[PDB]
Amino acid sequence: MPPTNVRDCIRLRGLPYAATIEDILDFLGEFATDIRTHGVHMVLNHQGRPSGDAFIQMKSADRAFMAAQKCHKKNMKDRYVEVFQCSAEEMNFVLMGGTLNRLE
Numbered sequence: 001m002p003p004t005n006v007r008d009c010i011r012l013r014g015l016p017y018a019a020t021i022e023d024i025l026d027f028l029g030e031f032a033t034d035i036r037t038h039g040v041h042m043v044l045n046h047q048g049r050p051s052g053d054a055f056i057q058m059k060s061a062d063r064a065f066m067a068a069q070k071c072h073k074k075n076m077k078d079r080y081v082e083v084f085q086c087s088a089e090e091m092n093f094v095l096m097g098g099t100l101n102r103l104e
Helices: 021-034 061-070 088-096
Strands: 009-013 035-044 050-058 072-076 079-086
Touching (some): 021 050, 035 088
Antiparallel strands (some): 035 050
16 A cells, blocks of 8 residues: 555644553544554653654544644643644654754
8 A cells, every 4th residue: 555645644742741642542532533553653752751742643634634623732631732733744754853944
């Protein structure tokens, strides 16, 4: 099956320190029900602990958009997690640590 770049991926950002797998599912709500098999990838930092970034690939791009809209800076317990939709390419790009231009 050819890897198709669909915008079915979502980047969560600002996740709590040690937000658990069920905790993140709660946060997702019903959107966790349409997640692709092992679609949830948490980004770890040097220490081997979450960067606060996570990428979740859902089955459907429409659901991903809906989730990214629903959770675009949503209050997760006591934190605000800003969720943004992404493509498979964007997901890999951030995971690979692609060149992101920010003159700051």
